[PDB]
């Protein structure tokens, strides 16, 4: 009968949702219990979700980002619910937690290494498959460890295999890790220092020496990759320490020349691309500004622009006193300057033909 399954799932839902009310009739009486009975009476039907939003219930599959939600999963192992053999021992009766990635990390590092250990102890897999399942469960551990957090902020040989495979993968992760410019280099300094004491810490040091009870090939490779780490780390720190209406704010541009005065007294290509960033700010401002006043405002606009290029040649002469960058600033800023020379002299003609 469907009634023993129905009342079993009802008593389980009263156990796991924990809201004392007739709300079972307030939600399930629509599509709910019909979807449940068609879930239990159709082939290939293997999943079901119920979400408890604190007090509310939803029988669905799509998880919302609403806080204090709880998850329960229902699966019938058989295509129906059998009247003969009891359904109380349902193969999947799962209740979970609000955040999924934390639960996958916890389940990886707490509850299911017994599946790795004790079935290996008993029958089925004493073969290479035991080594295989250990290695790729270690892969599970490494992946669920790294893809969270980093986004947001005879025995001897196999133990050597695990403790060298995890560093093959983690070195792939490290080499992936080697105001867009300012934030870019600040992030680079912070992340690379954080990995640099993720690599010089205690347990990593013991792992390097335990592996150095083998001394085969890999350890010179991690030596050279640490050599990659340290110099980039310190140099990123150095330039981070260096990097720390516009009519009112042309004296700030003197500060900019002085920064170029003070910094260069680094490497040239980022210097030119910083000049490109300055020019894209200037184009941002010169669109922020916008038939007879138009000539006046575009006169102001070219006036700011000629202070900009005058500061360029001031920087050039003071460099001579104390070559491609000219062409680059020409490219960006002069593309803009001819866009609005065209429109400004267009409005000059428009005013003169407004005198008829």
């Amino acid at each position: 009968v469907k009634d023993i399954r129905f009342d079993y799932i009802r008593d389980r839902v009263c156990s796991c949702l924990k809201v004392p009310d007739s709300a079972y009739d307030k939600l399930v009486s629509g599509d709910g219990r019909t979807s449940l009975v068609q879930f239990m009476e159709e082939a290939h039907t293997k999943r079901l979700l119920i979400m408890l939003d604190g007090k509310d219930l939803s029988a669905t599959v799509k998880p919302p980002p609403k806080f204090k939600k709880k998850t329960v999963y229902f699966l019938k192992l058989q295509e129906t619910k059998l009247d003969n053999d009891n359904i109380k021992k349902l193969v999947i009766h799962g209740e979970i937690s609000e955040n999924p990635l934390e639960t996958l990390a916890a389940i990886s590092q707490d509850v299911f290494m017994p599946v790795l250990t004790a079935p290996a102890n008993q029958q089925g897999w004493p073969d290479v498959v035991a080594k295989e399942v250990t290695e790729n469960l270690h892969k599970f551990v490494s992946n669920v460890f790294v893809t969270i957090g980093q986004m947001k902020g005879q025995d001897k040989i196999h133990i050597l295999e695990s403790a060298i495979v995890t560093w093959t993968k983690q070195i792939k992760n490290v080499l992936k890790a080697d105001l867009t410019e300012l934030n870019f280099w600040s992030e680079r300094a912070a992340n690379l220092n954080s990995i640099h004491e993720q690599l010089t810490s205690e347990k990593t040091q013991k792992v390097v020496k335990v592996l150095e009870l083998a001394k085969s090939t890999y350890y010179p490779a991690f030596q050279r990759l640490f050599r990659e780490v340290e110099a980039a780390q310190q140099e990123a720190n150095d330039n981070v320490k260096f990097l720390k209406l516009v009519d009112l704010f042309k004296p700030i541009m003197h500060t900019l020349m002085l920064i170029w005065k003070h910094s260069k007294s680094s490497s040239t290509r980022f210097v030119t691309l910083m000049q490109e960033i300055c020019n894209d700010l200037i184009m941002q401002a010169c669109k922020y500004v916008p038939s007879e006043a138009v000539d006046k405002l575009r006169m102001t606009l070219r006036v700011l622009g000629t202070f900009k290029n005058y500061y360029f040649e001031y920087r050039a002469l003071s460099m001579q006193d104390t070559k491609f960058q000219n062409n680059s600033l020409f490219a960006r800023l002069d593309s803009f300057l001819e866009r609005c020379h065209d429109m400004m002299d267009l409005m000059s003609t428009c005013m003169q033909f407004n005198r008829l």
Binding site: V61, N86, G94, S97, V111, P114, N136
Partner: protein
């Protein structure tokens, strides 16, 4: 931080699932309350798993049970045949009493059946949408997660593959003849795999995987044990045959293990050409010969024949399919495919040059027929497209029925 409140919450939940209402559920969660405090608040235990076995009804009724069996509120949630678990692993670094227990402690309710079904259900089948929804909800970390779940799928594949005196004389005959004949059969698996078809090189890996699975099944099945003891008693009819079959089984098992792990190393660089673009294989081929050339510095006729015939079968499959889905596209694709076959043969002949330097029948037949049936058709379409510039100057008074001659020749 409150031991007793979460203790009685887990009492209520393990009662609602198990049916042990108050007495020994609360006594067993109450007993050794130092550890019950030292999981919840303090460091050490990240769960306290009450598993409950059964000895009389095999836990099938599940409504309620006595405590004649030994339940273990142990740290580990083991997977044996007999005990139903509850883990209540806590999703909080420090146990906070104010937060409720059913929003961080997931129940450990487990089917009494073994390790095939529940774990693949809980890994691959159930969790399909939330990461994907999190794929929809703003991540760059989309890469290598799809193949991570293909690794979960191959877990599912391998667990489905693997988990699935006159009277004494009568017993000996009854359990020997059958199993010796089956072992003799399984020592002939290399013969029924040489047949006539355009077959793909991953089926090789799957054949070797089936050999592994059946070898493990028979070697565990022998390790019913009373009939082995009966053999030891009855050495004083099949024991000559059993030592012979044992030597054969050990040699077959060892060569099967070596072949499977070395043939497994090949997969990540043969993988692009099974489903990708036709030009990709050109760049893949140097990596492919680095792999094959390093692996024949170790281990022959079965490897050569099966590997090369099936990989060339797959190249023909990919080229012919990727052409079949006009004129300039088709002529371009024929040029690309002929260049692919040419670079394959060129690099194999370079390989033979190296193999001669330091210390091809399938190639011949298959790519020679493919490349001749491509040269003929590519020259036909080049001639057709060179005659196709005539096709729109219809107003000149001498190009009217000339094109119908060309049309009949085409048709």
């Amino acid at each position: 931080m409150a031991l007793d409140n979460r203790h009685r919450l887990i009492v209520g939940k393990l009662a609602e699932a198990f049916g042990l209402p108050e007495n020994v559920i609360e006594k067993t969660l109450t007993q050794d309350k130092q550890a019950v405090n030292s999981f919840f608040t303090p460091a050490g235990p990240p769960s306290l798993v009450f598993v409950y076995q059964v000895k009389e009804d095999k836990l099938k009724d599940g409504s309620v049970g006595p405590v004649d069996n030994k339940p273990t509120l142990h740290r580990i949630g083991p997977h044996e045949r007999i005990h139903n678990s509850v883990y209540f692993t806590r999703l909080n670094p420090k146990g906070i009493n104010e937060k409720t227990l059913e929003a961080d402690m997931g129940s450990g309710e487990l089917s009494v059946l073994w390790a095939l079904e529940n774990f693949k259900a809980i890994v691959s089948d159930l969790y399909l949408p939330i990461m994907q929804e999190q794929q929809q909800w703003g991540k760059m970390s989309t890469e290598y997660l799809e193949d991570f779940l293909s690794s979960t799928a191959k877990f599912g594949s391998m667990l489905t593959e693997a988990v699935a005196d006159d009277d004494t004389l009568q017993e000996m005959e009854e359990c020997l003849t059958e199993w010796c004949r089956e072992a003799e059969l399984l020592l002939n698996q290399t013969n029924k795999i040489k047949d006539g078809e355009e077959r793909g090189p991953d089926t090789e890996l799957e054949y070797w995987r089936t050999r592994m699975s059946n070898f493990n099944s028979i070697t565990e099945h022998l390790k019913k044990e009373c009939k082995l003891v009966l053999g030891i008693c009855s050495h004083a009819k099949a024991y000559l045959r059993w030592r012979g079959l044992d030597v054969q089984i050990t040699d077959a098992a060892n060569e099967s293990k070596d072949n499977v792990k070395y043939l497994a190393t090949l997969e990540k660089s043969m993988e692009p050409m099974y489903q990708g673009r036709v030009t990709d294989i050109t760049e893949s081929l140097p990596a492919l010969m680095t792999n094959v050339r390093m692996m024949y510095t170790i281990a022959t006729a079965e490897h050569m024949t099966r590997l090369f015939t099936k990989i060339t079968n797959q190249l023909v499959r990919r080229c012919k399919e990727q052409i079949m889905e006009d004129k300039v596209t088709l002529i371009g694709n024929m040029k690309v495919s002929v260049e692919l076959a040419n670079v394959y043969r060129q690099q194999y002949r370079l390989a033979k040059e190296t193999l001669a330097a330091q210390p091809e029948q399938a190639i011949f037949l298959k790519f020679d027929l493919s490349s001749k049936a491509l040269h003929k058709l590519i020259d036909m379409f080049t001639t057709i497209h060179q005659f196709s510039s005539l096709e729109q100057h219809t107003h000149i008074e001498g190009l009217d029925t000339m094109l119908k001659s060309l049309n009949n020749i085409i048709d």
